[PDB]
Design an enzyme around this catalytic site. Structure first.
Site, PDB file in Angstrom:
ATOM      1  CD  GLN A   1      -1.281  -0.055   3.666  1.00 51.71           C
ATOM      2  OE1 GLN A   1      -1.717  -1.155   4.065  1.00 51.71           O
ATOM      3  NE2 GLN A   1      -1.734   1.105   4.122  1.00 51.71           N
TER       4      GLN A   1
ATOM      5  CB  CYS B   1      -4.752  -0.770   5.918  1.00 54.68           C
ATOM      6  SG  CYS B   1      -5.689   0.292   7.045  1.00 54.68           S
TER       7      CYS B   1
ATOM      8  CG  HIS C   1      -3.123  -2.784   9.819  1.00 50.87           C
ATOM      9  ND1 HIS C   1      -3.251  -2.052   8.650  1.00 50.87           N
ATOM     10  CD2 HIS C   1      -2.324  -3.838   9.509  1.00 50.87           C
ATOM     11  CE1 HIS C   1      -2.568  -2.645   7.682  1.00 50.87           C
ATOM     12  NE2 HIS C   1      -1.986  -3.720   8.180  1.00 50.87           N
TER      13      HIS C   1
ATOM     14  CG  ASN D   1       0.034  -6.452   6.678  1.00 50.70           C
ATOM     15  OD1 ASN D   1      -0.769  -5.576   6.392  1.00 50.70           O
ATOM     16  ND2 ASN D   1       0.857  -6.348   7.723  1.00 50.70           N
TER      17      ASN D   1
HETATM   18  C1  LIG Z   1      -4.517   1.647   7.438  1.00 50.23           C
HETATM   19  O1  LIG Z   1      -3.728   1.950   6.279  1.00 50.23           O
HETATM   20  C2  LIG Z   1      -3.573   1.339   8.573  1.00 50.23           C
HETATM   21  O2  LIG Z   1      -3.037   2.625   8.929  1.00 50.23           O
HETATM   22  C3  LIG Z   1      -3.988   3.642   8.587  1.00 50.23           C
HETATM   23  C4  LIG Z   1      -5.145   2.934   7.889  1.00 50.23           C
HETATM   24  N1  LIG Z   1      -6.152   2.809   8.952  1.00 50.23           N
HETATM   25  C5  LIG Z   1      -7.440   2.591   8.680  1.00 50.23           C
HETATM   26  O3  LIG Z   1      -7.893   2.666   7.538  1.00 50.23           O
HETATM   27  C6  LIG Z   1      -8.412   2.300   9.784  1.00 50.23           C
HETATM   28  C7  LIG Z   1      -8.913   0.873   9.611  1.00 50.23           C
HETATM   29  C8  LIG Z   1      -9.967   0.428  10.620  1.00 50.23           C
HETATM   30  C9  LIG Z   1      -9.383   0.291  12.007  1.00 50.23           C
HETATM   31  C10 LIG Z   1     -10.599  -0.878  10.155  1.00 50.23           C
HETATM   32  N2  LIG Z   1      -9.524   3.245   9.735  1.00 50.23           N
HETATM   33  C11 LIG Z   1      -9.411   4.497  10.194  1.00 50.23           C
HETATM   34  O4  LIG Z   1      -8.441   4.858  10.866  1.00 50.23           O
HETATM   35  C12 LIG Z   1     -10.417   5.516   9.741  1.00 50.23           C
HETATM   36  C13 LIG Z   1     -11.743   5.201   9.447  1.00 50.23           C
HETATM   37  C14 LIG Z   1     -12.609   6.195   8.972  1.00 50.23           C
HETATM   38  C15 LIG Z   1     -12.140   7.491   8.820  1.00 50.23           C
HETATM   39  C16 LIG Z   1     -12.987   8.552   8.249  1.00 50.23           C
HETATM   40  C17 LIG Z   1     -14.062   8.318   7.429  1.00 50.23           C
HETATM   41  S1  LIG Z   1     -14.735   9.786   6.841  1.00 50.23           S
HETATM   42  C18 LIG Z   1     -13.509  10.670   7.693  1.00 50.23           C
HETATM   43  N3  LIG Z   1     -13.336  12.021   7.663  1.00 50.23           N
HETATM   44  C19 LIG Z   1     -12.241  12.620   8.396  1.00 50.23           C
HETATM   45  C20 LIG Z   1     -11.744  13.903   7.756  1.00 50.23           C
HETATM   46  N4  LIG Z   1     -12.860  14.772   7.393  1.00 50.23           N
HETATM   47  C21 LIG Z   1     -12.353  16.034   6.824  1.00 50.23           C
HETATM   48  C22 LIG Z   1     -13.783  14.135   6.456  1.00 50.23           C
HETATM   49  C23 LIG Z   1     -14.310  12.801   6.924  1.00 50.23           C
HETATM   50  N5  LIG Z   1     -12.632   9.866   8.352  1.00 50.23           N
HETATM   51  C24 LIG Z   1     -10.792   7.807   9.079  1.00 50.23           C
HETATM   52  C25 LIG Z   1      -9.944   6.827   9.551  1.00 50.23           C
HETATM   53  C26 LIG Z   1      -5.621   3.252  10.237  1.00 50.23           C
HETATM   54  C27 LIG Z   1      -4.589   4.272   9.812  1.00 50.23           C
HETATM   55  F1  LIG Z   1      -5.247   5.440   9.483  1.00 50.23           F
END
Ligand SMILES: *[C@]1(O)CO[C@H]2[C@@H]1N(C(=O)[C@H](CC(C)C)NC(=O)c1ccc(-c3csc(N4CCN(C)CC4)n3)cc1)C[C@@H]2F
Ligand code: NA
Length: 216
Positions: free
Chosen positions: A20, A26, A163, A183
């Site tokens: 990635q 992720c 993650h 992963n």
């Molecule tokens: C992976 O690459 C591991 O490291 C990164 C990334 N992560 C995630 O994607 C995790 C996964 C979960 C635990 C299953 N998800 C989040 O951290 C996550 C989920 C949703 C959002 C979100 C949705 S809409 C939104 N916003 C925020 C900003 N404003 C302006 C608009 C709407 N945010 C964010 C993060 C974990 C790590 F990030």
């Protein structure tokens, strides 16, 4: 009772390990891996689906800032498709949504969330559906430097998911039950890109707390 061991790598349901990069995508790799499994089961063909399509187009997620797999499956359903990797290749930065129905390689009719904390339900879903999208606590240094064996760290926090990965099977190694986890940090990470994670050990690293699969 489900089989004692299942490994979808041996069944041709799992595409090669991806990297990635720095993008927080992720969730998109986890989602495409689950879709790829269902596409193989339905059509007989294994092909790479587009994580970039998800990154760029799932407005309920934050692109390279992270997201949820449930929102990805919802998008594929509402959008009436997802493109192949070849049609919509991965670049690891957010761009305008370039979804094209001509490049459509799979559809989704819904998704199912696994009952929270239930590793038996997760096992049955892996056995009877296919690879399942899961979230874990991957924040420990011990996870980062995983090499071999069944990963278990007493410090893993089942309440702190950070993650998204793909459960592609399960089994047992020298008495230690495990999940086989794909992963998205390249083949150079872990064991050729994979980690075996403790199974039926008090929901280690939160493996059954945010699991879901798409329906085709
Ligand atoms: C992976 O690459 C591991 O490291 C990164 C990334 N992560 C995630 O994607 C995790 C996964 C979960 C635990 C299953 N998800 C989040 O951290 C996550 C989920 C949703 C959002 C979100 C949705 S809409 C939104 N916003 C925020 C900003 N404003 C302006 C608009 C709407 N945010 C964010 C993060 C974990 C790590 F990030
Ligand atoms: Na949603």
């Amino acid at each position: 009772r489900a089989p004692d061991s299942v490994d979808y790598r041996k069944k041709g349901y799992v595409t090669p390990v991806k990297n990635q990069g720095q993008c927080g995508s992720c969730w998109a790799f986890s989602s495409v891996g689950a879709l790829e499994g269902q596409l193989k089961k339905k059509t007989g063909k294994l092909l790479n689906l587009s994580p970039q399509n998800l990154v760029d187009c799932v407005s309920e997620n934050d692109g390279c800032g992270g997201g949820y797999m449930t929102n990805a499956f919802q998008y594929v359903q509402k959008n009436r498709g997802i493109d192949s990797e070849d049609a919509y290749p991965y670049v690891g930065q957010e761009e305008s949504c370039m979804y094209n129905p001509t490049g459509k390689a799979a559809k989704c009719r819904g998704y199912r969330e696994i009952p929270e904390g239930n590793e038996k339900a997760l096992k049955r879903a892996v056995a009877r559906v296919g690879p399942v999208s899961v979230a874990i606590d991957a924040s420990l240094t011990s996870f980062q430097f995983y090499s071999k064996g069944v990963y278990y760290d007493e410090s893993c926090n089942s309440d702190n998911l950070n993650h998204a990965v793909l459960a592609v099977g399960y089994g047992i190694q020298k008495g230690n039950k495990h999940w086989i986890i794909k992963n998205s940090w390249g083949e150079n990470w872990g064991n050729k890109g994979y980690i075996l994670m403790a199974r039926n050990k008090n929901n280690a690293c939160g493996i059954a707390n945010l699991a879901s699969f798409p329906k085709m």
